[PDB]
Amino acid sequence: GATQSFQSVGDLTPAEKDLIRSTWDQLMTHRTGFVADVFIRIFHNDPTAQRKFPQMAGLSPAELRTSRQMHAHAIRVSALMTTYIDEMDTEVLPELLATLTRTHDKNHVGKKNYDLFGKVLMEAIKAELGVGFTKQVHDAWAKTFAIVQGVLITKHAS
Amino acid sequence: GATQSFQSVGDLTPAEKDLIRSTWDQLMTHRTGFVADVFIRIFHNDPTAQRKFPQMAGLSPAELRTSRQMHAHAIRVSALMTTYIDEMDTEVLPELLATLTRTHDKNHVGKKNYDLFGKVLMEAIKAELGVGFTKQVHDAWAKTFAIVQGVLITKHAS
Ligand code: HEM
Numbered sequence: 001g002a003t004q005s006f007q008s009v010g011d012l013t014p015a016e017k018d019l020i021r022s023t024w025d026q027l028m029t030h031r032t033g034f035v036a037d038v039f040i041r042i043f044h045n046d047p048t049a050q051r052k053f054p055q056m057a058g059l060s061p062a063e064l065r066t067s068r069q070m071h072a073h074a075i076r077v078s079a080l081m082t083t084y085i086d087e088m089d090t091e092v093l094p095e096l097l098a099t100l101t102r103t104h105d106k107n108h109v110g111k112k113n114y115d116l117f118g119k120v121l122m123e124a125i126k127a128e129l130g131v132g133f134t135k136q137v138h139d140a141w142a143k144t145f146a147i148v149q150g151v152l153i154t155k156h157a158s
Numbered sequence: 159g160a161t162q163s164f165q166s167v168g169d170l171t172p173a174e175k176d177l178i179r180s181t182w183d184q185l186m187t188h189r190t191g192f193v194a195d196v197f198i199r200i201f202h203n204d205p206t207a208q209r210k211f212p213q214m215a216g217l218s219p220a221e222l223r224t225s226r227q228m229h230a231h232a233i234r235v236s237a238l239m240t241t242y243i244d245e246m247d248t249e250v251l252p253e254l255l256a257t258l259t260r261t262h263d264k265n266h267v268g269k270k271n272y273d274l275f276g277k278v279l280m281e282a283i284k285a286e287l288g289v290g291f292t293k294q295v296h297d298a299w300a301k302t303f304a305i306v307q308g309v310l311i312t313k314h315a316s
């Protein structure tokens with residue numbers, strides 16, 4: 001329990017920061033790719049997943065890769081993520097994220113469900129095996145998912 | 159009452175279409191501009207407005223132009239609108255719009271509230287008085303707000 005200075009308290013650093021801008025560009029050639037991929041994977045270990053997304057709605061877990069009611073979330077979330085990227089240390093990062101915390105905080109998205117996304121995201125970054133991408137991204141992206149994920153709070157405000 | 163072919167049944171035409179792509183570009187220099195402007199206006203004639211948006215939440219109708227919890231909706235909705243623009247005759251326009259129809263259809267957004275947005279949008283286009291912009295945009299944009307607005311249905315499905 002805390003009541004803090006609420007900002008994404010230190011967004012890595014300029015030296016670490018810069019990478020997630022030029023890396024995002026590379027991995028977001030594939031708006032339907034990297035994210036729909038990042039998602040079919042989360043759905044394979046977790047059960048709890050495929051039922052809490054209204055439009056994927058319990059119809060067929062495993063069969064995926066792409067088709068109709070899923071190519072929609074592939075982009076929907078991805079241009080809006082290029083909004084979080086664009087607002088990296090730009091004031092409206094609090095108010096932006098909070099309307100999104102209003103979404104997830106409803107259903108029952110918490111600390112369990114979050115460490116599905118954030119380590120399957122780590123695996124997506126392996127398939128772009130252009131040899132050993134530096135350990136500063138293996139700190140940095142881990143440091144981002146640690147401070148940007150709904151600024152940690154969702155149900156954390158008593 | 160109908161059960162139709164549901165698509166945005168004829169998105170104007172290539173001849174009319176083209177304009178809303180090169181016009182969108184001009185008017186979406188100002189992501190916080192044109193939309194926050196398009197919105198402060200809706201709020202001046204309608205009462206019903208300023209209370210149904212969770213983040214503008216009843217605190218001060220008239221004072222606006224910009225500040226914190228409103229510069230957030232200014233962009234949020236605008237990159238996602240460049241998604242509808244980008245998907246003009248691209249299959250995922252049904253599934254894209256429908257998750258958005260799921261949002262508005264909840265509260266009580268209907269045919270009344272819609273002809274606030276769509277004629278205040280007409281007025282925004284006047285302030286870009288670069289002399290008399292052709293009557294084909296004064297058909298076309300009127301023809302778009304007539305077929306893209308949550309593909310008309312929201313509460314229209316019995
Ligand atoms: C960096 C990670 C994530 C971000 C920033 C993100 C982003 C988004 C976005 C943009 C939306 C739409 C919000 C709106 O309605 O305005 C969304 C929807 C959703 N998210 Fe998160 N998401 C993330 C992680 C997760 C995780 C780990 C869960 C875990 C349960 C999750 C579950 C959902 C659900 C249930 C929806 C509803 C889909 C709908 O009907 O539109 N997301 N997310």
Ligand code: HEM
Nearest residue numbers: 099210211212213234235238258261262265267271272275
């Ligand atoms: C071309 C016109 C419009 C479009 C495409 C549009 C788009 C959007 C978008 C992108 C959202 C966020 C949906 C989400 O949660 O994922 C939104 C929210 C909302 N819209 Fe619409 N809008 C339009 C017209 C209107 C009108 C005329 C009303 C009338 C009442 C309205 C009221 C709302 C409300 C109540 C919100 C909730 C804001 C929030 O808490 O995020 N909008 N709209």
Ligand SMILES: [C-]#N
Nearest residue numbers: 053073077104
């Ligand atoms: C969010 N998915």
Ligand SMILES: [C-]#N
Nearest residue numbers: 211231235262
């Ligand atoms: C929608 N505003």
